[PDB]
Write a protein that binds this DNA or RNA. Structure first.
Ligand SMILES: *[C@@H]1O[C@H](CO)[C@@H](O[C@@H]2O[C@H](CO)[C@@H](O)[C@H](O)[C@H]2NC(C)=O)[C@H](O)[C@H]1NC(C)=O
Ligand SMILES: *[C@@H]1O[C@H](CO)[C@@H](O[C@@H]2O[C@H](CO)[C@@H](O)[C@H](O)[C@H]2NC(C)=O)[C@H](O)[C@H]1NC(C)=O
Ligand SMILES: C=CCn1c(=O)n([C@@H]2O[C@H](CO)[C@@H](O)[C@H]2O)c2nc(N)[nH]c(=O)c21
Ligand SMILES: C=CCn1c(=O)n([C@@H]2O[C@H](CO)[C@@H](O)[C@H]2O)c2nc(N)[nH]c(=O)c21
Ligand SMILES: *[C@@H]1O[C@H](CO)[C@@H](O)[C@H](O)[C@H]1NC(C)=O
Ligand SMILES: *[C@@H]1O[C@H](CO)[C@@H](O)[C@H](O)[C@H]1NC(C)=O
Ligand SMILES: *[C@@H]1O[C@H](CO)[C@@H](O)[C@H](O)[C@H]1NC(C)=O
Ligand SMILES: *[C@@H]1O[C@H](CO)[C@@H](O)[C@H](O)[C@H]1NC(C)=O
Ligand SMILES: *[C@@H]1O[C@H](CO)[C@@H](O)[C@H](O)[C@H]1NC(C)=O
Ligand SMILES: *[C@@H]1O[C@H](CO)[C@@H](O)[C@H](O)[C@H]1NC(C)=O
Lengths: 762, 762
RNA sequence: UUU
RNA sequence: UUU
């Protein structure tokens, strides 16, 4: 480079994007390009905005000035904002091309004035604005999107009811989206402009809908009235219900004007009845969320479903009656109306026994993909019943009591300041009480692609006779179980098995004297991936694992340290006969060193090797000559103190060397000499002081995709003159260059960034 | 003190004990007291011993010079010993009073010569000495104890058979203890001096005992011949069996001379028969270890037990037949002979069903205390059977398959280089497959004091009707289960319950929508201690826990960070009504801060409080005024950067302040002013540079039991003059004062210990 | 850093 | 650091 970075911001270029997110700034920086279209300054501590702020920046279409002063309870309690953001007059009115402005999370007291007529989007979430006046909104003639939420709630209280003048929004003739969520609003702020497409009014104090409230809103596609007269039972937040357990009162004709309506969410409204009359003039409804109400009875009746032939998703989760364990699930025949239904969820209805007939109302739903009966405390269920449901993508019985955060969020859509479904048909029996299994349990289920048994009781000496019906099965998640690997024939029946997870089945590996057989993988002739993480495996009766197919083995969280104890050669070839193995994760095996033999004993095609988080205190680098196809080596989070004298005499194939979080204090004189194949190198979080040219030749350095250097101990004396220069001028990506690549001394420069460092005197 | 305090060694004083264990020394230090009786230099890197080594140290009775050069595979692989310890002539022969010498782990090639005639004990374990000659042993006329083991085994191989000359030990007329374990010895080194009391010959290549091998050893109390013709099945180390699965051959009359013999260990000898004839002349046998042999059949017969009326412990663990799941436990009636038996262990016999009668041979054993049938894969057992065994201290069924390292060590006695039994009768059902429970399961067991159900399947909504027979129960370990705390009546039946462990029952706390009732503790009117660690508790339907009795609550590894989320007051009194609570562990709750109300909401008698390992980034010290009985505060492993301006305006009662492992860079000007009650203060592993007198006044400092200062960033300039002086002269214990309390600068003194620092120039 |  |  002719001139160094200097600017503390990622200047991408598409549109000219300047991104100064979380750069510990107290002023907008100098040097921002004149052609800047989008400028982001979110999470900084810039205490004011003036006409100087954006003076030259005439082509700005977007300003993201979020979270420079987030409200006290929302922010960090180490770094509390002492004084609200100040916005002086005239700061925005120069900006003719400005289309989006984001001033959320700045403790603003009022809608900021003097905004340009070009503005289409204004976002003021998480401020202290709880009174909307018509006069304050006339600057927004041309506004289309308006976020006003999260200014009066339990985490950012205003201590009063929210106030919106009569007809405040009406003369916003182009307004499409309006969000007043999380605000302590008491009524729908009539009259609303008919142009509205989305209206978010959830988590508020609206006790009633008047029948003229949505009179003119023909174009409305999304309505959310959730959390008004909330159902408070086991709320993980402060929850005040409406008096007498009352519901949100919605006149039978309240929706008659909403012809175009695609999404209606009535989550947590304490509803007991879903009067069919609501939906008379709503033909095209696609999505209905009725979760967290009191509709256990209404689900038996449910006449309203007769008016919903277009409905793709219906949510009836968490409608149980308190203190009531129903013996079964009374589903309405009405459900058969729901011709278009792709997704149905009925978690938290709370019943003991599921029988095949209770689901009969759904048998003809042609488009049905997802049936979710999770978290129902179901104790009894003949799983063969799902023979009818071969066409379903997912059948979720997760969290039950079978044995042969989302619904409880306050605001799941809240914005920040910053799987095996793809294998085919899936039956999720996770987190259930299944202690024993046998073939009959899976009879008529030969269609299943993924079976999830994670988090059951299964404490069984699997012999190959247990999943015998499941010959289409590609994925078995057997994690968080108590597999007893006595027989090498475990899992051999699953002849189509591509992926097996036996992670966190440590129980029986923790006790001495117990025969385990890790050689069970010869039998599984299509197995691509095996996960046996966190099993505490320190003993094995067989001494090799063999497979012709296995590409990936995750072996983290075991005791290879015991198996490879110095002077015990028995297990040095444990992975040798995994002949296709490209990827081996042996991180967290409390390996303080590697005996000779470990690398010779690796399989031939090893591409990607993780020894992360072991406590490695030493490492013979020369032994990487045995791993002739090695491309990524992960030695992160260890106690290594030195790099090889010559990486090119260790491994000519290595592209990615991860050394972050070690105890390296310098580099060897010719470290990277000749390592032309190297592309990525992470030396971050070490204790390096100096780096000379001999170690980091330009030949090799300038071909790196990335070089990570942050969190070291750089000495910024005139001995550092080459490195400081090189960093300052190189094209090579070096993340955190303007935040965490800093000098620690000498004196003057202590704390100073290497990129700002001007060492004239040399 | 008049003089620092410069020797790098704990000078205890009883006998004058000088201990320089692990002090990174390369020479014996100067200044060792002339009256030194015991000197320890184990784990250092002192490369030789000379007549200078001990010149002045004339009263020495013991030298522990262990592990200054441990063998390559036994030692650290970062810091491998480059060259064996050298012992020059005349180094020991000045020491007239020397009685013990420990030169283990120094890579010595030969028994060191020139030793004094006063010497009673010589230890040479973990060296490279594998040939014993008579000539080399004549210096030891007066030796009583001789450790020669661990010079030829898989971890420290000599590559040949061990050699002992005929009659090598015979002219050691005072020899009592001789250890040749772990040595590749092929025969008992005859003839042995009759004076031998203990003889350790385990883990060797001894295929046969000749009948003259122990002819003259009337005084022998302990014999160990274990691991000779080892049973190699699931050995966690390299194990070579005798050919044809042969046993260690022991002539029927081999023990006839051993009249005094108290302990006989025949562990891992591949024995099939225990011929009664062995024990004909051994009256007083107290301890017999027959574990890891092939005695499944012999246990049915077992005629030899008839000759063992004095036997206190019998071990028959791990004798199962490979590939054989016995339907029951064929115990001999012979067992009834064992009148004196206190402890019996029969782990790893491997059977399916235990019935009450199989134990009938033991019914009259009056002195029986411990019956251990662990690790037997027992699937069925009526636990009421133990009605007969009310007099037993412990009944261990740990590691089984019931549902209504030790035996596998190489050398368990190997030396290093450095519970609820007390409640009464105990039934350990740990690590079993018990999924459901009910009252009948515990019928006739009302005698039990401690029940251990740790590590079962138990996934049940305990209602108070499950342990109803157990009214003497003082201790329930319910850990590593799946408690479902739906009912507040859980555990109320156990009216004598002093201690309850529901730790690591996180399963059902990890899923949303599930009602949990932490208020179950009101009912339990004698409960002293409750452990509910590692439960992931982030949701609770009740908002208080009440108890009149509870002294200790361990709540580590939960989510108080969610329960006390800023702006949610509901849980701020969660512990208030634990009225007798003296001790609260709320470490590992990922608490980045504490909201106001947390300390006002603590119970009145809180004495010690742990907030360790939370990520605390700040802390209002002034709110410790609410904890008027606080005595220990543990804020270790957090991100705190400052201490209070005045600890005495925060808490006048605090005795023990633990601040280790934080980010403190300086102290407040008057930190400890007036804090006369303070006794312990740990400031170790921070980033402190200077400490002035104003912060650490003498009147407060000199009353400390302990002050921890290591692993800081001390700047050793003339500004440090008071602190360097104070550290140098004080009586107050400061651990690691000569190892990890060091200057980091300026220049000259970088790395130097504060205690050696001479500041004349200031 | 003899397990 | 809007969950
Ligand atoms: C939502 O508005 C209500 C009232 O309209 C606020 O509740 C009042 O709070 C003040 C100060 O705490 C009390 O003195 C009053 O008793 C309350 N009035 C009524 C009528 O209930 C509430 O604080 C607002 N919510 C938030 C989160 O700010
Ligand atoms: C124990 O002694 C045997 C000799 O009985 C040693 O085994 C020899 O090892 C060398 C390796 O260099 C072989 O070439 C010999 O042929 C082996 N001989 C036999 C008879 O097995 C053994 O190494 C010794 N054990 C240890 C642990 O040092
Ligand atoms: C087969 C049922 C009981 N069983 C058993 O006899 N054995 C035998 O126990 C011994 C140790 O595993 C061996 O003889 C082995 O074959 C067992 N080993 C394991 N791991 N699990 C069992 O359920 C079990
Ligand atoms: C009691 C039998 C089934 N059951 C139940 O009805 N409930 C009810 O389900 C709802 C959620 O826990 C509540 O109404 C609760 O009372 C349950 N809650 C838990 N935690 N565990 C059960 O086994 C269970
Ligand atoms: C830039 O701004 C426009 C309008 O605000 C927006 O639609 C676009 O996605 C923004 N692009 C980026 C990368 O921020
Ligand atoms: C199985 O269920 C658990 C939830 O209990 C989930 O974490 C996991 O991703 C699921 N497994 C797969 C393969 O989808
Ligand atoms: C697995 O291991 C043992 C040898 O330790 C052997 O008995 C068994 O037959 C092997 N089986 C397979 C399927 O590889
Ligand atoms: C000191 O040495 C004697 C004799 O060698 C020994 O018996 C004694 O226990 C040792 N004491 C201590 C405190 O190490
Ligand atoms: C219960 O059993 C486990 C062994 O599985 C043990 O760790 C624990 O200490 C035992 N509990 C008590 C209270 O002794
Ligand atoms: C608190 O009590 C004592 C200090 O008196 C200490 O031994 C104990 O381990 C401490 N534990 C916790 C959890 O605070």
């Amino acid at each position: 480079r002719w001139f160094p970075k200097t600017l503390p911001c990622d200047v991408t270029l598409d549109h000219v994007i300047v991104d100064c997110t979380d750069k510990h700034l107290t002023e907008i920086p100098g040097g921002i390009p004149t052609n800047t279209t989008n400028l982001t300054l979110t999470i900084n501590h810039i205490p004011d905005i003036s006409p100087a702020s954006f003076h030259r920046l005439v082509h700005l279409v977007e300003i993201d000035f979020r979270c420079n002063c987030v409200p006290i309870r929302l922010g960090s309690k180490s770094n509390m904002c002492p004084r609200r953001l100040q916005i002086k007059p005239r700061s925005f009115s120069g900006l003719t091309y400005l289309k989006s402005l984001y001033l959320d999370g700045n403790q603003l007291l009022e809608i900021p004035q003097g905004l340009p007529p070009s503005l289409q989007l204004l976002s003021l979430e998480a401020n202290n604005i709880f009174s909307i006046r018509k006069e304050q909104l006339t600057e927004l003639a041309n506004i289309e999107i308006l976020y006003l939420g999260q200014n009066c709630y339990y985490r950012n209280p205003c201590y009063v009811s929210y106030s919106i003048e009569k007809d405040a929004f009406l003369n916003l003739t182009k307004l499409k989206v309006l969000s007043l969520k999380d605000n302590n609003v008491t009524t729908v702020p009539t009259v609303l402009p008919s142009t509205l497409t989305e209206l978010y009014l959830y988590n508020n104090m609206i006790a009633e809908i008047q029948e003229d409230d949505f009179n003119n809103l023909n174009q409305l596609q999304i309505l959310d009235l959730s959390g008004n007269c909330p159902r408070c039972y086991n709320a993980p937040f402060p929850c005040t219900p409406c008096k007498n357990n009352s519901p949100l009162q919605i006149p039978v004709n309240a929706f008659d004007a909403l012809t175009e309506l695609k999404v209606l969410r009535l989550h947590s409204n304490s509803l007991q009845h879903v009067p069919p009359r609501w939906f008379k003039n709503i033909n095209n409804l696609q999505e209905l969320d009725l979760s967290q109400n009191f509709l256990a009875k209404e689900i038996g009746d449910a006449k309203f479903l007769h008016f919903l032939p277009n409905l793709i998703q219906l949510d009836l989760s968490f409608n149980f009656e308190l203190q009531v364990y129903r013996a079964s699930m009374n589903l309405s025949q009405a459900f058969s109306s729901l011709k278009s239904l792709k997704i149905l969820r009925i978690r938290g209805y709370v019943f003991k026994e599921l029988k095949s007939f209770q689901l009969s109302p759904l048998h003809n739903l042609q488009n049905l993909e997802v049936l979710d009966l999770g978290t129902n405390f179901i104790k009894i269920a003949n799983l063969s019943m799902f023979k009818q449901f071969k066409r379903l993508k997912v059948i979720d019985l997760s969290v039950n009591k079978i044995s042969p955060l989302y619904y409880f969020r306050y605001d799941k859509y809240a914005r920040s300041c910053r799987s095996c479904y793809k294998y085919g048909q899936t039956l999720d029996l996770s987190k259930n009480s299944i202690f024993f299994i046998k073939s009959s349990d899976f009879q008529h289920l030969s269609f299943l692609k993924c079976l999830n048994l994670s988090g059951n009781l299964i404490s069984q000496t699997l012999n190959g006779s247990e999943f015998q019906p499941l010959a289409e099965l590609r994925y078995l998640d057997f994690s968080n179980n108590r597999l007893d690997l006595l027989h090498s024939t475990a899992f051999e029946e699953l002849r189509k098995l591509e992926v097996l997870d036996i992670s966190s089945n440590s129980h029986y590996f923790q006790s001495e004297g117990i025969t385990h057989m890790l050689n069970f993988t010869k039998n599984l002739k299509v197995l691509q991936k095996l996960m046996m993480n966190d099993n505490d495996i320190s003993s094995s009766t067989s001494r090799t694992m063999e497979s012709e197919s296995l590409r990936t083995l995750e072996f983290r969280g075991n005791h290879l340290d015991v198996l490879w104890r110095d002077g015990d050669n028995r297990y040095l070839q444990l992975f040798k006969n995994l002949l296709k193995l490209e990827e081996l994760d042996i991180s967290k095996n409390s390996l303080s060193f590697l005996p000779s033999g470990v690398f010779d004993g690796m399989p031939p095609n090893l591409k990607n090797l993780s020894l992360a988080k072991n406590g490695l205190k030493s490492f013979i680098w020369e032994k990487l000559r045995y791993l002739k196809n090695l491309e990524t080596l992960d030695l992160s989070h260890n106690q290594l103190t030195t790099v090889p004298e010559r990486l090119s005499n260790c491994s000519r194939s290595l592209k990615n060397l991860i050394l972050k979080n070690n105890q390296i204090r310098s580099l060897t004189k010719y470290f990277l000499q000749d390592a032309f194949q190297l592309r990525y190198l992470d030396l971050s979080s070490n204790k390096i002081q100096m780096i000379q040219k001999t170690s980091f030749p330009e030949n090799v350095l300038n071909n790196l995709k990335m070089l990570l250097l942050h969190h070291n101990r750089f000495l910024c004396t005139c001995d550092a003159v080459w490195f400081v220069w090189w960093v300052q001028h190189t094209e090579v990506t070096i993340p955190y260059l303007a935040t965490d690549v800093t000098c620690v001394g000498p004196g003057a420069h202590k704390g100073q960034s290497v990129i700002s460092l001007d060492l004239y005197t040399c």
